[PDB]
Amino acid sequence: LRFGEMERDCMIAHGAASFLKERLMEASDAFRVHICGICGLMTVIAKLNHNQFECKGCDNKIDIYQIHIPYAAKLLFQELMAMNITPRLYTDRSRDF
Amino acid sequence: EAGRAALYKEVYNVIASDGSYVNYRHMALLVDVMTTQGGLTSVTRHGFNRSNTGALMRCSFEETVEILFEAGASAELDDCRGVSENVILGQMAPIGTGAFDVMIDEESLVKY
Amino acid sequence: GQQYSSAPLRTVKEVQFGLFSPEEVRAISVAKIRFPETMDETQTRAKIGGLNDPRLGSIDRNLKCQTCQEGMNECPGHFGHIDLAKPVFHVGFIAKIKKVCECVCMHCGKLLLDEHNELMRQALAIKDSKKRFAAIWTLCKTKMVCETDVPSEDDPTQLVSRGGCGNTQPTIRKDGLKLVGSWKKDRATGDADEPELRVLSTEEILNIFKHISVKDFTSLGFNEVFSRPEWMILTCLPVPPPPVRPSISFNESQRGEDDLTFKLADILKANISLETLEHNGAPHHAIEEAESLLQFHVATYMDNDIAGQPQALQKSGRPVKSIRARLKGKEGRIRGNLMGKRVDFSARTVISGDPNLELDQVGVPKSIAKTLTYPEVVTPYNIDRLTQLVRNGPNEHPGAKYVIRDSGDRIDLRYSKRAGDIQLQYGWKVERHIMDNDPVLFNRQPSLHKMSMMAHRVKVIPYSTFRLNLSVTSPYNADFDGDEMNLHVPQSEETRAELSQLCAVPLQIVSPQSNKPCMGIVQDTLCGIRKLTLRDTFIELDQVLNMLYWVPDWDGV
Amino acid sequence: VSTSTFQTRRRRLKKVEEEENAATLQLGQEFQLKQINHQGEEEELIALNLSEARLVIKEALVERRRAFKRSQKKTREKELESIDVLLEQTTGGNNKDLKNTMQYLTNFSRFRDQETVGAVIQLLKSTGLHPFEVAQLGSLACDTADEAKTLIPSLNNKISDDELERILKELSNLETLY
Amino acid sequence: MFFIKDLSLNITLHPSFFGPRMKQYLKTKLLEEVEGSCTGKFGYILCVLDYDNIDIQRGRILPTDGSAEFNVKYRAVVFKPFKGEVVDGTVVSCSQHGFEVQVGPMKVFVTKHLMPQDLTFNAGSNPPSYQSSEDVITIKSRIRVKIEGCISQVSSIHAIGSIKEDYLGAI
Amino acid sequence: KAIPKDQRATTPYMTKYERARILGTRALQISMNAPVFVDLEGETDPLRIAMKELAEKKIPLVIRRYLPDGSFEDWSVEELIVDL
Amino acid sequence: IFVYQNNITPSAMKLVPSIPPATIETFNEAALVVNITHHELVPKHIRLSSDEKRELLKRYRLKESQLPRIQRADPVALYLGLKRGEVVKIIRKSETSGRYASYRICM
Amino acid sequence: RLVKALEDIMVHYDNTTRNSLGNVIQFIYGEDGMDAAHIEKQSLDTIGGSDAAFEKRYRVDLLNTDHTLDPSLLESGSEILGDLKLQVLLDEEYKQLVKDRKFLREVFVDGEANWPLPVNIRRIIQNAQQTFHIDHTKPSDLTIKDIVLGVKDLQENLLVLRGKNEIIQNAQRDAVTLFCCLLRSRLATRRVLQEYRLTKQAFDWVLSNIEAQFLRSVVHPGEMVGVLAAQSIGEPATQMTLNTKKVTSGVPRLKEILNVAKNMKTPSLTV
DNA sequence: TAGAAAGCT
DNA sequence: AGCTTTCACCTGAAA
Ligand SMILES: Nc1nc2c(ncn2[C@@H]2O[C@H](COP(=O)(O)CP(=O)(O)OP(=O)(O)O)[C@@H](O)[C@H]2O)c(=O)[nH]1
Ligand SMILES: [Mg+2]
Ligand SMILES: [Zn+2]
Ligand SMILES: [Zn+2]
Ligand SMILES: [Zn+2]
Numbered sequence A: 001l002r003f004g005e006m007e008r009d010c011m012i013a014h015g016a017a018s019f020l021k022e023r024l025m026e027a028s029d030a031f032r033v034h035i036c037g038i039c040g041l042m043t044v045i046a047k048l049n050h051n052q053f054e055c056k057g058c059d060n061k062i063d064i065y066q067i068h069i070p071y072a073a074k075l076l077f078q079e080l081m082a083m084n085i086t087p088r089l090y091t092d093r094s095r096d097f
Numbered sequence B: 001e002a003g004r005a006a007l008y009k010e011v012y013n014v015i016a017s018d019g020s021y022v023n024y025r026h027m028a029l030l031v032d033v034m035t036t037q038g039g040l041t042s043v044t045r046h047g048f049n050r051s052n053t054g055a056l057m058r059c060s061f062e063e064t065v066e067i068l069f070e071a072g073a074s075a076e077l078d079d080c081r082g083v084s085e086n087v088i089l090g091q092m093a094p095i096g097t098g099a100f101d102v103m104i105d106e107e108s109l110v111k112y
Numbered sequence C: 001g002q003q004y005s006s007a008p009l010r011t012v013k014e015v016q017f018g019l020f021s022p023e024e025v026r027a028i029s030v031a032k033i034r035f036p037e038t039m040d041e042t043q044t045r046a047k048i049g050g051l052n053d054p055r056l057g058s059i060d061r062n063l064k065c066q067t068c069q070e071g072m073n074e075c076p077g078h079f080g081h082i083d084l085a086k087p088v089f090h091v092g093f094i095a096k097i098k099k100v101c102e103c104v105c106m107h108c109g110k111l112l113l114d115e116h117n118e119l120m121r122q123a124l125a126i127k128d129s130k131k132r133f134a135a136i137w138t139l140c141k142t143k144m145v146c147e148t149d150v151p152s153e154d155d156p157t158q159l160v161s162r163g164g165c166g167n168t169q170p171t172i173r174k175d176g177l178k179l180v181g182s183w184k185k186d187r188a189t190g191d192a193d194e195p196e197l198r199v200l201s202t203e204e205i206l207n208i209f210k211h212i213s214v215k216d217f218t219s220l221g222f223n224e225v226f227s228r229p230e231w232m233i234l235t236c237l238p239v240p241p242p243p244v245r246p247s248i249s250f251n252e253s254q255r256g257e258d259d260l261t262f263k264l265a266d267i268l269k270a271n272i273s274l275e276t277l278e279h280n281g282a283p284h285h286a287i288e289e290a291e292s293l294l295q296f297h298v299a300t301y302m303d304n305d306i307a308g309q310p311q312a313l314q315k316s317g318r319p320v321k322s323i324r325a326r327l328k329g330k331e332g333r334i335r336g337n338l339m340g341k342r343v344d345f346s347a348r349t350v351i352s353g354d355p356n357l358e359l360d361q362v363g364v365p366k367s368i369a370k371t372l373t374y375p376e377v378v379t380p381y382n383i384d385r386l387t388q389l390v391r392n393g394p395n396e397h398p399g400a401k402y403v404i405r406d407s408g409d410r411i412d413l414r415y416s417k418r419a420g421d422i423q424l425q426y427g428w429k430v431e432r433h434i435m436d437n438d439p440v441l442f443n444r445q446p447s448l449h450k451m452s453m454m455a456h457r458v459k460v461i462p463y464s465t466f467r468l469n470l471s472v473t474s475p476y477n478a479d480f481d482g483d484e485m486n487l488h489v490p491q492s493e494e495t496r497a498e499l500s501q502l503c504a505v506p507l508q509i510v511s512p513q514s515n516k517p518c519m520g521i522v523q524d525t526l527c528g529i530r531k532l533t534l535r536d537t538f539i540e541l542d543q544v545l546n547m548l549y550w551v552p553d554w555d556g557v
Numbered sequence D: 001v002s003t004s005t006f007q008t009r010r011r012r013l014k015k016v017e018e019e020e021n022a023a024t025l026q027l028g029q030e031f032q033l034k035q036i037n038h039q040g041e042e043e044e045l046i047a048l049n050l051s052e053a054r055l056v057i058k059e060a061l062v063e064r065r066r067a068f069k070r071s072q073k074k075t076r077e078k079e080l081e082s083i084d085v086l087l088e089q090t091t092g093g094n095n096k097d098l099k100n101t102m103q104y105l106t107n108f109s110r111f112r113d114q115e116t117v118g119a120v121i122q123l124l125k126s127t128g129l130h131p132f133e134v135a136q137l138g139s140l141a142c143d144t145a146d147e148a149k150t151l152i153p154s155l156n157n158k159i160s161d162d163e164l165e166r167i168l169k170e171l172s173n174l175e176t177l178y
Numbered sequence E: 001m002f003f004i005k006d007l008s009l010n011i012t013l014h015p016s017f018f019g020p021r022m023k024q025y026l027k028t029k030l031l032e033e034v035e036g037s038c039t040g041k042f043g044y045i046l047c048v049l050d051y052d053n054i055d056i057q058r059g060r061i062l063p064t065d066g067s068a069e070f071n072v073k074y075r076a077v078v079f080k081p082f083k084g085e086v087v088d089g090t091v092v093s094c095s096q097h098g099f100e101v102q103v104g105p106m107k108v109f110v111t112k113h114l115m116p117q118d119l120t121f122n123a124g125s126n127p128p129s130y131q132s133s134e135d136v137i138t139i140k141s142r143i144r145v146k147i148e149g150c151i152s153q154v155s156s157i158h159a160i161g162s163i164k165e166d167y168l169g170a171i
Numbered sequence F: 001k002a003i004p005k006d007q008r009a010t011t012p013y014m015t016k017y018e019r020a021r022i023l024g025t026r027a028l029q030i031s032m033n034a035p036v037f038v039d040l041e042g043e044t045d046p047l048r049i050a051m052k053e054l055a056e057k058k059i060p061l062v063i064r065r066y067l068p069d070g071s072f073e074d075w076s077v078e079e080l081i082v083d084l
Numbered sequence G: 001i002f003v004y005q006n007n008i009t010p011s012a013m014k015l016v017p018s019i020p021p022a023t024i025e026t027f028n029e030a031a032l033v034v035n036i037t038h039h040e041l042v043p044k045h046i047r048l049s050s051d052e053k054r055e056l057l058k059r060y061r062l063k064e065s066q067l068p069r070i071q072r073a074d075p076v077a078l079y080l081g082l083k084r085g086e087v088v089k090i091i092r093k094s095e096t097s098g099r100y101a102s103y104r105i106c107m
Numbered sequence H: 001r002l003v004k005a006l007e008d009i010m011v012h013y014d015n016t017t018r019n020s021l022g023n024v025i026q027f028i029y030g031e032d033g034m035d036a037a038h039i040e041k042q043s044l045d046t047i048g049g050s051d052a053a054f055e056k057r058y059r060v061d062l063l064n065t066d067h068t069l070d071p072s073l074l075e076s077g078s079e080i081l082g083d084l085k086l087q088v089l090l091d092e093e094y095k096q097l098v099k100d101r102k103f104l105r106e107v108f109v110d111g112e113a114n115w116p117l118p119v120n121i122r123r124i125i126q127n128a129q130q131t132f133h134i135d136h137t138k139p140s141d142l143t144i145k146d147i148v149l150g151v152k153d154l155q156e157n158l159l160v161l162r163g164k165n166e167i168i169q170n171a172q173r174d175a176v177t178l179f180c181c182l183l184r185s186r187l188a189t190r191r192v193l194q195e196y197r198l199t200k201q202a203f204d205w206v207l208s209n210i211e212a213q214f215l216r217s218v219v220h221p222g223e224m225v226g227v228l229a230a231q232s233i234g235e236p237a238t239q240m241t242l243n244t245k246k247v248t249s250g251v252p253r254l255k256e257i258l259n260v261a262k263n264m265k266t267p268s269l270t271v
Numbered sequence I: 001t002a003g004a005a006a007g008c009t
Numbered sequence J: 001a002g003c004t005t006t007c008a009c010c011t012g013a014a015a
Helices: A005-014 A017-024 A071-082 B002-015 B024-036 B064-073 B083-089 B106-111 C022-028 C094-101 C118-125 C131-140 C202-210 C214-219 C259-279 C287-302 C323-327 C333-339 C366-371 C383-392 C493-503 C523-532 C541-550 D052-070 D077-090 D096-108 D114-124 D131-139 D145-151 D161-174 E022-033 F016-031 F046-055 G050-059 G075-079 H002-006 H051-058 H084-107 H121-132 H144-156 H166-186 H189-196 H200-217 H225-239 H251-259
Strands: A031-036 A045-047 A052-054 A064-069 A085-090 B101-104 C014-019 C080-089 C233-239 C346-354 C361-365 C373-377 C400-404 C410-412 C429-433 C439-443 C453-461 C466-469 C484-488 D034-036 D042-044 E003-013 E043-048 E059-061 E068-079 E086-094 E098-103 E106-111 E120-122 E129-131 E136-138 E142-153 E156-162 F061-066 F072-076 G002-004 G026-028 G044-047 G087-092 G100-106 H024-026 H040-043 H114-117
Touching: A005 A017, A005 C333, A005 C453, A005 H225, A017 C493, A031 A071, A064 A071, A071 A085, A071 B083, A071 C233, A071 C323, A071 C333, A085 B064, B002 B024, B002 H225, B002 H251, B024 H002, B024 H024, B024 H225, B064 C014, B064 C323, B083 C333, B101 F016, B106 E022, C022 C233, C080 C202, C080 C259, C080 C287, C094 C202, C118 C131, C202 C233, C259 C287, C287 C323, C323 C333, C346 C361, C346 C366, C361 C366, C361 C439, C366 C453, C373 C400, C383 C400, C383 C429, C439 C493, C453 C466, C453 C493, C466 C484, C493 F016, C493 F046, D052 D077, D052 D096, D052 D114, D052 E043, D052 E068, D077 D096, D096 E043, D096 E086, D096 E098, D114 D131, D114 D161, D131 D161, D145 D161, E003 E022, E022 E068, E086 E106, E086 E136, E098 E142, E106 E142, F016 F046, F016 F061, G050 G087, G050 H166, G100 H166, H002 H225, H040 H121, H051 H084, H051 H189, H084 H144, H084 H166, H114 H166, H121 H166, H121 H189, H121 H200, H144 H166, H144 H189, H144 H200
Parallel strands: C346 C466, C361 C453, E106 E156, G002 G026
Antiparallel strands: A031 A064, A045 A052, A085 C014, B101 E059, B101 F061, C080 C233, C346 C484, C361 C466, C373 C429, C400 C410, C400 C429, C439 C453, C439 C484, D034 D042, E003 E068, E043 E068, E059 E068, E086 E098, E086 E142, E098 E106, E120 E129, E129 E136, E142 E156, F061 F072, G044 G087, G087 G100, H040 H114
């Protein structure tokens, strides 16, 4: 069934923070990517069986994180990337405000 | 400041035209929202959606791709403070239930 | 159900937007993407070491990925690349590319105005990365000459020599995908009367952009790290992997490649024409022809719905669907796949009202209850109850559909040979039926209210309708003239609490919208309440006793 | 999940330069002379001598045994068997590295006592050398100031041949006669 | 060498352990992971110091599962080798190719060529030995090696060394 | 930065959301076979054990109330008034 | 302040920013005929001192940007001779509170 | 449009109303800091009527033989007469009630007395009456100090904003301004004693309830007011259509407004 | 389906 | 400079 844009809105009005996440992720979409800590991209070769994780073209074999995002966003990211845009994802912050 | 008063007067006048009653605060907020930027910032594709809120938040209304192309060009940094950007990322929004963090205190956990 | 990964699990706190550096595109790429040939190793069903898996993502399903060993679910795609024969404008940046030229010298790469001009230092002052560029542009568009010497920040007699280059600046306009200028000229001080009308090559603009000082471009929209202006022009094109452009491989010996798989092939094809065209006996006009064709294919791949008419249609008359169009709202990625989603654990049926239902309840048909499942953790509290639901089966009401071990493997209670002989274990999950008094989210689109979605109490009933209490009609805007409603089931003890503690029908009784209660006594009850409470209305003892008993909390008095 | 440090530096996109490590005291980014203790305060790098180190571990492992039996309420060849006992009690055993480290430290230790090691630490921390040099001068026994300035090439101009030769004489006097 | 580095690990507890013997488990889980560990960044993490005063901090309960993340602030003894470092160690193995020397937790290997020419291999000896016109290097002997280069390798940091230079070799 | 317990300014009373979240948290934890801090007087639903834990103010949870700027105020469920 | 009848030529107006720290203002006689401040909908706007402002900002943990903004050109900002960065405490009477204090920083 | 324009606004832990940027929209939610749910249209008795009727209802003069409270009202009535000290506390009272009236007539200029306000005071006194079995014959156990002072004290406890400093504390006053006007209007000495006929326990219970009832009424930080308000203006606009001088009105005027349309359909001045 | 914000002669 | 030229449109359910 559809939990459309309007349904999301009442869920916000309500404050049901987790319930909104649950519908969007667990009760739907939800995927697990491996991202590089240098260039916040899905570049990571995740051989999660031999515990090796690399991002050649960073040569990073250390600063790798695991993130949970909707498979649509994973898609959206790759889509924008294919159109020469870098949607870099960072697990830390720097601005503060 | 007078512009704001007129803006609400005229807003309220529509709500009360149908006879219906909406509590002051609501219209007051929309009026205040349009007002705060310094002038009459419209509830349009080029009025509010033109402000400095996050790229992912703004892209979720009207200039979807066009926004994301400018995002890349001016190398924008998304706050991930907005509801929308969290919905997109599939993270618990900082809304109601998510506006604060929960912690265990080993101290009290020992007291009991 | 994705496997355990060592990698520390975190959340996104920042999204750093930027542009792909052709150097990055190369580095990150697990292959190039040399052939337009899809796959079929010379008709042999299996991917070609040229397009869609020359290390890439993975088709086949019963085939692990060529780079990471994961395969299908667990394996996001791995990007590819295509070294273009000649640089091409990115269709989106086409305007900014032009607006950048309009601001800088088309020969030396220095800003057409600087700190020596008053209005410029004032426009340069502006803190906003877009508003700065806005003012900078409107100022520099009209400056048609790169100045060698400018009057000093003190006197007009002693003119300060800023940067060099005297060159006249072209007047740019677009011919759709082509940037063409018109240099003012001089001939006996006047002329134009007839100017110099040369078209600006991608490669020239590219070179001028490279020469734009870091300081200069940072004063314009740009950023030396993530978005240099030179990166608006495409040299190395990133090839998206299968997940993006799936091969919908129907039956067996039959393809079903995505529009984008054909558009990239079109680009590949267009590139090899231009590559050999210029390596071989270059008939020069035929190059500026094979070039413009590549600039088009790469253009329409990203955005097919451009102003300059040619719709670039698939050989079926139908236009080729751009990446841009996928993202474009009310359906498509952002709006329809991310802000809105199709969801599991949801039910919809025709609604009809019940007077012998409590306000906060919802009649749920036995079929829908037998379909909808809650994941419960085998705790010493329920350990007993749960085994009985598990024993009960997925076919008979208070029962369960699955048992999920610690081992993260599903037990299909429906078919499993051990459906009886299944002793539980704490920490396991019993996916049980939706039972009486579980919280659920009831909904009626519209959905213009905080109130158009409320949390109810399940009360399983016969017959195929959702049975709601009549007084809770008004806040949904529901009627029973053919109306259907949605029901969503929470999954965590956490999300149940969310519904129960915030979104429940009794909590919603008083509307913040209008500071007045949003539900009341309606229809039959409203009609009969007048009719009952007139001075004239009297009830005989026989009935009084029945009326009394009918009230559930009656004192017994 | 792995361990992090006090050094917070944000290398956003700009990966490298990974300038090699040498005895040009160009140690890691992590192994900076100017490091930071997790109380927020800046602190000089901690480098140890094979004994300053042996005594550190032994002590911490000993106080662990103390705390473990507290929470339970409700001669070189001879020191090797002695340490082997403590490790079997405090360490996970699977940590074969610490076992090897303790045997190496027990056999290659220059100073037997906490008084001796204490006194060594005084003598050496007078010099104003970079903790690495200071530890290496303590853990390695040298005679000629040349023997030293060759093995610790980081010294070279940092100290008078005679003065270093004075320290080396004093260090030799300290060496606990096994 | 042998450093005292201040470090921090992010450990995630399951709610089953939200009892009073919590700090007790957390501290023992830290020592599980961290102690014995080997990173290229900090080298060998051999021993966790000041067990009694390990900094727990408040643990933030994770949004969709009861687990709570603790950044356990700590301090330990680390051994991270470097090029140019002079190390005292004992031989382990011996071949035509060279000899492997045990220096603390790690092994430094010395090539037949990273040795002075006069020191020749002798296969016909129990166990194998490297014989010079003065001294003999064999399985139990002590050596002072100059680390020429390091390789960060999973559970170890192997290295190559020289005994050809002055003031180096057997001792 | 972390506002000190004395300099605290937020509602001394627990927000409708905090209450919903602590009950939801304890319930999820209790369910995940966590240690129950109260006498289950025949109780078997984690959400009712959660309310019981909350009614005796015997929940070891701490609300970190972040402020617009970033600074925050730490409050205990043991100290937050429940007029809700 | 220079109250002009009909116009000030662009020749003359170039002399307006010439003499700092002193500031020059121009008001069209025709605008002044009626006082805008006296109007029903225009409430009490008050200039804040550098100290008053520093405190307002501190007390509400604000960055100057985070403040509701008054335009430089605002009929009231002109009346009061507001300058970029100066704050106005705006006091309106509320149908909800009785009296409400707003704040506007300049642009 | 309204929702996408407001979504990110909510009450933060300082009673402020801010967006994703954290830019202040409102300083205190709905210029009073109250949740709309806990508000009922209450009557500001003080505002209307003759200055004569006002005098009759609120004036206590322990120095005049006719304007004292008859000892039928309270036990103290006999001993209360002529007390200059107490009469300064009532002069204090009546001088504030007058001040209040002049202010109310400044705000609601048409003299409209019915305003949506928290804590139903009418009900509290009504409920106290049956809760305590108030004898509309016998005299009260209250003092003039019991009333005048107790109400003054309750007011200091009606907290919306907490912070210790002028900026915040002065803002606290401002938020509670109108409620207090009503509180004083409905809890004046003559009123409490003649009309309500409350005992001390009754009056002490009325005060403890207004206190609690008020504190319940304040907005909860986290409250998603962006969407709340956007849907509150949004939903009615839909039932204007989706169901069954001459100026442009309804959906088109609303559309005209939100867009901030320059060239409007029916422009007009009201001179 | 019609309304403003770019840029045109 | 002023007219021209240029650039989103309700929610879920259906075949
Ligand atoms: N959001 C939308 N709601 C719609 C739409 N079409 C119908 N409705 C809903 O349908 C309902 C009105 O239904 P009808 O036209 O069938 C009403 P009926 O003539 O039987 O009624 P009375 O109101 O009782 O005189 C009302 O709740 C609307 O929300 C639509 O296109 N969009
Ligand atoms: Mg209907
Ligand atoms: Zn990377
Ligand atoms: Zn792969
Ligand atoms: Zn030039």
